[PDB]
Design a binder for this molecule. Structure first.
Ligand code: NAG
Length: 169
């Protein structure tokens, strides 16, 4: 079986977080992220993976992944995937992409399916040596059942918004 147990709207990163160092990529590791091991409860052989989609405009590229734009001065590299941040899939474009190939829980057991979203800031332009970014809608992640598993009457999609932050130049 499957049931939705998480939240529809999720914030990425600590609000008002500040990060210090073209394009220039800020090393923020996993600090600007959202992670929740338990978004769907699954059991008895349910098989599920994850699809992700970024709605921000693509303003460039870096090593194969899109630089998504927030402001004329700030962009973002974005990853979406299974719970642990190391499993993140680098996002490109604006279409649904497979960000977690999936797994099946046991026939006689139960567990949960989670997810993570992580971004790293990119300075596109310079300017009081500071860059502010308002709360911004990023995109979404939808569970992707397989092997005959069914979404049934369950919420399949959750959204993500980037919490406001400040970059120090
Ligand atoms: C740690 C936990 O409670 N549940 C994890 C879940 O977050 C993850 O999506 C899934 C597939 O890797 O594996 C479960 O064990």
């Amino acid at each position: 079986a499957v049931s939705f147990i998480g939240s529809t709207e999720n914030d990425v990163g600590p609000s008002l977080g500040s990060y210090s160092r073209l394009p220039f990529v800020y090393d923020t590791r996993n600090k600007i992220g959202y992670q929740n091991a338990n978004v769907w409860h699954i059991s008895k052989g349910f098989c599920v993976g994850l699809d992700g989609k970024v709605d921000l405009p693509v303003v460039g590229s870096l090593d194969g992944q899109s630089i998504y734009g927030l402001t004329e001065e700030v962009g973002l590299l974005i990853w979406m995937g299974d719970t642990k941040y190391s499993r993140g899939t680098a996002m490109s474009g604006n279409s649904w992409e497979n960000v977690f190939s999936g797994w099946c829980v046991g026939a006689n057991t139960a567990s949960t399916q989670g997810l993570s979203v992580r971004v790293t800031p990119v300075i596109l332009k310079r300017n009081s040596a500071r860059y502010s970014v308002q709360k911004t809608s990023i995109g979404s992640i939808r569970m992707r059942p397989y092997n005959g598993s069914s979404a049934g009457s369950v919420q399949t999609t959750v959204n993500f918004s980037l919490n406001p932050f400040t970059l120090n130049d």
